[PDB]
A paper describes a structure:
Uropathogenic Escherichia coli strains use filamentous type 1 pili to adhere to and invade uroepithelial cells. The pilus consists of a flexible tip fibrillum, formed by the adhesin FimH and the subunits FimG and FimF. The pilus rod is a helical assembly of up to 3000 copies of the main subunit FimA, terminated by a single copy of the subunit FimI that anchors the rod to the assembly platform FimD in the outer membrane. The assembly platform FimD in the outer membrane of uropathogenic E. coli is the catalyst of type 1 pilus assembly.
The assembly conditions were further optimized to produce a sample with an average pilus length suitable for cryo-EM, allowing us to determine the overall structure of the FimDHGFAnC complex to 4.1 Å resolution. However, the rod was initially not well-resolved due to its flexible connection between subunit FimAn-1 occupying the pore and FimAn-2 emerging from the pore. Multi-body refinement in RELION-5.033,34 further enhanced the resolutions, yielding 3.6 Å for the pilus rod (body 1) and 3.9 Å for the assembly platform (body 2). By combining the maps of the two bodies, we constructed a composite map that includes both the assembly platform and pilus rod, which sits at an approximately 51° angle on top of the usher. On the periplasmic side of FimD, the FimAn-FimC complex is bound to the CTDs, while the preceding subunit, FimAn-1, occupies the pore of the usher. The NTD is unoccupied and not well-resolved. Multi-body refinement provided insights into the movement of the pilus rod relative to the assembly platform. Although restrained by the rim of the β-barrel and the extracellular loops of FimD, principal component analysis revealed a twisting motion of up to 11°, as well as side-to-side and back-and-forth motions of up to 19° and 18°, respectively. Multi-body analysis indicates that the connection between FimAn-1 and FimAn-2 serves as the main pivot point for pilus rod motion relative to the usher.
Author numbering:
A (entry chain D): 116 to 187, 194 to 453, 478 to 613, 617 to 803, 809 to 833
B (entry chain B): 20 to 159
C (entry chain C): 1 to 92, 101 to 205
D (entry chain A): 5 to 159
The structure:
């Protein structure tokens, strides 16, 4: 039966195929500079250099971050973060030593410095991510199952006569009505439907997420102290649409336990209720005990795919404080209630009305922090327009605080023809108008796009007008994403202010085969090594070209996934032919993986070989040891060779013959040469 | 306070070419393409933390976390949209008020990374997928 | 089994090397790929050379065929030209099957009077007894599918540029004609109606 | 407190169908020849069935593809009979394989294509065919393996 069979999920990659990477250095630099010229204060120069060093030795990844600031008057190198990370495959987890952040969802985001061992969801196959019901069934006789969504089929497979569990269903959005239809060979078809509603705290059945964090507490504010603390987080997916999530936050003065359950009621929707009980010692000697409840509701699609409602209520009784209040200074009003109501309604298949309301009441201070947001985004053909309104009445006498915004994007392709070769096709006009409901108007009309062959050079010229003051603030920007780095230069003109921004960002890899420069790196990187193939653009990426040595670096690669790295054969020197123009690499988190390509630098040759005035047979192998090349005879004795010298000899092994040949310089200059050489 | 870096106001991201084999059924996603939002002159004292929220047209009510591609004269792809991930790897609701994860504002330049991805709602027809989104930044 | 990147390769004039992807989805399968180009008459020709002509693919792998031009600008620069690219996968008591995938290679002149978008609409119909001739004034190869003459499909037609293709029509079909042409990327254009001009 | 816009531009390209013929290596097994049974020209053998799947592609691009068979004809009269391809002691005499249709009509090996008429089986689009031996006068106890070529025109 399928249930007893160890059927792997769709898109599953064995952990053995995962590439740890190579032992190599890493250095990402980002220099920025601002020249501000004001009539009142002459001119001033600001410089900020961000340097991010790293070393990937074995599987450990050491990373360090530093900042240097300069004014025009001193140099101050400032460390920020240092962390040694690793992935533990058997535990399906990631370990971090040193600085870091707590990714806690049940608890609040906490920055710390210590050891964190946390399960990682990226390591799981893409099919087994998010929330999706797992189908359990018993099929009498060999059957074929077609789990189909409201729109189309999803999972079609064959099931033996026995128990079967299917958990490869994709997330398929927040709401879905999966109709499971099994068709037996003999019996009539058996159908049943299951609806579902997903919540970010819900987990798949038999899925476990854990997080163990220990160490000192680090915060940007100088007032806050640095106490040692521990944090355990657990998220388990029970059968039948239940999820149990627990947590423990322990310290010297703060001890909290969070327990919560989430339920998938199907057509009704999704629910999540958790209670956190916390005993905290305030900055003063007083001890406070409290409990907080966070109820969260997600309604399914009302009408026919029109409305979605989210209701998040939070009741924090007096005496409930987060870890920050405990970690305040030695000597330094709680939220009685919070309500978030979000309603999204789609109309006309184009307009998407989003209404959001936050309503927070405090203990004692009866003033309520009301916040209403209304967005209306519509996409009529190429025109993309948006009207937004905001209204904020907070406790500290914020008044009405209303805001209105109108943004229109009009691509030039609306007027330009489809096949236009002008550079204006990759351009658009953006018009924005903002009102503060008091007479404050902020108009901004601009053109933007790209103007290079590879669409690297992105330009944006936007003028404006701020009126109460009447200031016409112009703004021009040019960003260039080349094969060595990104260079941006901009000119911001005001009534009496002229700002000149200039910056360069780049990445350096000191791998085994010399130093390679490229675009700024982003977690995992792919080092494409194609020696002898100079200035060969890679595919599906903008401005990533090999240097003179043939080594280039790809900024981003998906972790624990099959990603394709291809060299664009069109924009490659006619003297060079690649044995393989496409490679596949599966990198680990923050790993430098080498996608090696073999390139032949000699001329491209098509040889008609005849033996005893007879064409060589199909499948004959034609090699050349003079330049280490190989090929297979196609038909009529036609064989293809890449990377061959001007004058040479080849060997043919149909099942041992030699063929001599010479070529003129005009043939060497020709793109592809064709010659006939009778073999011995 | 501070503001978005010059040039990061209007940004364009080339997702590339994706095939129906990669996006054949609902929930199938392509390879994420990275892009960053840059802020300058953000000091720790004035604003410790910041986050962004994207506002864009949803392809359908059921999938509110993915965008809707605009129609074109040549022909627009059907049953496919653009999805914006985060540093943690989770989807972002395209509502104006739903913000992203908080970040620590280092003194001076600060770059926030994000990923753009293709999200297929059913079988995907070939064509050209172009989508727009508007982002607002909140400082804490 | 091997697969091609696209069902329609459009080669613009003036380039030298077009690229077409070949992929092997099966993990355990050894193949020999042999590729060539024939003219509109199904005759092997050397005007386009696919490199490498014959190569060995082991396991799940993807390669790129480079279509090098050798026209020497001998083709017309007024209308599109049609060619057939054939890719054969030799699977090196049982009969073995070698699969030949055939795709359309459109040699498209760089400058054309009409953009590709408006080509589909301007397709007129000449209706007579047992005939539903399609006249295409636009300089593009029109791939008409789902040719509905009221309540019946006729067949799939490939109208040449500036030409009139012929299709046999049963007399029972109605006057109303609805069709839809395959666009550049391979999708189906929304169903248009047909004029009798 | 306010920001601008980000636009995403990309292409979604249609992919040609992946063709799977019978079992692995595009091989379909046939029953051994019966010397006594393969007596006359009209004598046949077991009509073994198989199928070709057009997977990893849309049900429209798969359905719009024309289909044809081709190969080497053994004789001028025996157009529909595929010549056995064997050069060894296992070569048989006056034997060959015929590739039939769904109904049972012979399929021309010249190359004249026909509409696929793919059946949309729960997995993917499928086209079924059959192969059977066709004696042409005499039989010999040998492995008469043949080779045929499948042609798919992606309209």
């Amino acid at each position: 039966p399928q249930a007893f069979m160890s059927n792997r999920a769709r898109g599953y990659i064995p952990p053995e195929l995962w590439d740890p990477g190579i032992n190599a250095g890493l250095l990402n630099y980002n220099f920025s500079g601002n020249s501000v010229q004001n009539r009142i204060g002459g001119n001033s120069h600001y410089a900020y250099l961000n340097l991010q060093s790293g070393l990937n030795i074995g599987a450990w990844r050491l990373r360090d971050n530093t900042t240097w600031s300069y004014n025009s008057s001193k140099n101050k190198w400032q460390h920020i973060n240092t962390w040694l990370e690793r992935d533990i495959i058997p535990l399906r987890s990631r370990l971090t030593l040193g600085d870091g952040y707590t990714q806690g969802d049940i608890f609040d985001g906490i920055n710390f410095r210590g050891a964190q061992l946390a399960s990682d969801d990226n390591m799981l196959p893409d099919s087994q991510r998010g929330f999706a019901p797992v189908i359990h069934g018993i099929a009498r006789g060999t059957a074929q199952v077609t789990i189909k969504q409201n729109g189309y089929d999803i999972y079609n497979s064959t099931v033996p006569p026995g128990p079967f569990t299917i958990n490869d269903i994709y997330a398929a959005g927040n709401s879905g009505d999966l109709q499971v239809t099994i068709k037996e060979a003999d019996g009539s078809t058996q159908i049943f439907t299951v609806p579902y509603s997903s919540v970010p705290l819900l987990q798949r059945e038999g899925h476990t997420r854990y997080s163990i964090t220990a160490g000192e507490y680090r915060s940007g504010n100088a007032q806050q102290e640095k106490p040692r603390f521990f944090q355990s987080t657990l998220l388990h997916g029970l059968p039948a649409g239940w999820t149990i999530y627990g947590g423990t936050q322990l310290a010297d003065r703060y001890r909290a336990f969070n327990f919560g359950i989430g339920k998938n009621m199907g057509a009704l929707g999704a629910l999540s209720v958790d209670m956190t009980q916390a005993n905290s010692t305030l900055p003063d000697d007083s001890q406070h005990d409290g409990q907080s409840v966070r109820f969260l509701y997600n309604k399914s699609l009302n009408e026919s795919g029109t409305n979605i409602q989210l209701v998040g209520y939070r009741y924090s009784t007096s005496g409930y404080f987060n870890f920050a209040d405990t970690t305040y200074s030695r000597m330094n009003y709680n939220k009685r209630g919070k309500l978030q109501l979000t309603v999204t309604q789609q109309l006309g298949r184009t307009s998407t009305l989003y209404l959001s309301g936050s309503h927070q009441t405090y203990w004692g201070t009866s003033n309520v922090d009301e916040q209403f947001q209304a967005g209306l985004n519509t996409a009529f053909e190429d025109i993309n327009w948006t009207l937004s309104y905001s209204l904020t009445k907070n406790a500290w006498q914020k008044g009405r605080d209303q805001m209105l915004a109108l943004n229109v994007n009009i691509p030039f392709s609306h007027w330009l023809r489809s096949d236009s070769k002008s550079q204006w096709r990759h351009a658009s006009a953006s018009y924005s108008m903002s009102h503060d409901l008091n007479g404050r108007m902020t108009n901004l009309a601009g053109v933007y796009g790209t103007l290079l062959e590879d669409n690297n050079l992105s330009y944006s010229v936007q003028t404006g007008y701020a009126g109460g003051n009447s200031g016409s603030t112009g703004y021009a920007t040019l960003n260039y994403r080349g094969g060595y780095g990104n260079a941006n230069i901009g000119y911001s003109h005001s009534d009496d202010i002229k700002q000149l921004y200039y910056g360069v960002s780049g990445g350096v890899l000191a791998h085994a085969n010399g130093v390679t420069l490229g675009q700024p790196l982003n977690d995992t990187v792919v080092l494409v090594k194609a020696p002898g193939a100079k200035d060969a653009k890679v595919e599906n990426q903008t401005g990533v070209r090999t240097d003179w040595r043939g080594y280039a670096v790809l900024p981003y690669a998906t972790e624990y996934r099959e990603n394709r790295v291809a060299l664009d054969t069109n924009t490659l020197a006619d003297n060079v032919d690649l044995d393989n123009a496409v490679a596949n690499v599966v990198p680990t988190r923050g790993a430098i993986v080498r996608a090696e390509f073999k390139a032949r630098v000699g001329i491209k040759l098509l040889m008609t070989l005849t033996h005893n005035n007879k064409p060589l047979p199909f499948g004959a192998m034609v090699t050349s040891e003079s330049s280490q090349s190989s090929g297979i005879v196609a038909d009529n004795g036609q064989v293809y060779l890449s990377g061959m010298p001007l004058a040479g000899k080849v060997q043919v092994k149909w099942g041992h013959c030699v063929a001599n040949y010479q070529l003129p310089p005009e043939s060497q200059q020709q793109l592809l040469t064709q010659l006939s050489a009778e073999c011995r | 306070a501070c503001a978005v870096d010059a040039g990061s106001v209007d940004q364009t991201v080339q997702l590339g070419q994706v095939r129906t084999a990669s996006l054949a059924q609902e929930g199938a996603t392509s390879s994420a393409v990275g892009f960053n939002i840059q802020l300058n002159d953000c000091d720790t004292n004035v604003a410790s933390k910041a986050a962004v929220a994207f506002l864009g047209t949803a392809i359908d009510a059921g999938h509110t976390n993915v965008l809707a591609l605009q129609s074109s004269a040549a022909g627009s792809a059907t049953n496919v949209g653009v999805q914006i991930l985060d540093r943690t790897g989770a989807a972002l609701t395209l509502d104006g008020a739903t913000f992203s994860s908080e970040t620590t504002l280092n003194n001076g330049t600060n770059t926030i990374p994000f990923q753009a991805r293709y999200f297929a709602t059913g079988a995907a027809t070939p064509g050209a997928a172009n989508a727009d989104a508007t982002f607002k930044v909140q400082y804490q | 089994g091997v697969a091609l990147g696209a069902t329609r390769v459009i080669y613009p004039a003036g380039q030298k090397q077009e690229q077409l992807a070949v992929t092997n989805n099966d993990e355990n399968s050894t193949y020999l790929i042999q590729s060539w180009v024939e003219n509109a008459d199904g005759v092997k020709d050397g005007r386009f050379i696919v490199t490498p002509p014959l190569f060995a693919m082991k396991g799940k792998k993807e390669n790129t065929l480079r279509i090098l031009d050798a026209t020497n600008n001998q083709l017309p620069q007024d209308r599109e030209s049609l060619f057939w690219m054939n890719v054969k996968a030799i699977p090196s008591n049982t009969l073995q099957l070698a699969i030949i995938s055939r795709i359309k290679l459109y040699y498209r002149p760089a400058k054309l009077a009409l953009p590709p978008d408006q080509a589909a609409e301007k397709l007129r119909f000449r209706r007579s007894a047992n005939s539903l001739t399609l006249i295409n004034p636009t300089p593009y190869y029109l791939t008409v599918t789902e040719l509905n003459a009221g309540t019946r499909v006729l067949e799939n037609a490939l109208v040449p540029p500036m030409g009139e293709s012929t299709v046999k029509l049963p007399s029972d079909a109605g006057s109303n004609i609805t069709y839809r042409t395959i666009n550049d990327y391979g999708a189906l254009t929304p169903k248009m109606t047909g004029v009798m001009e």
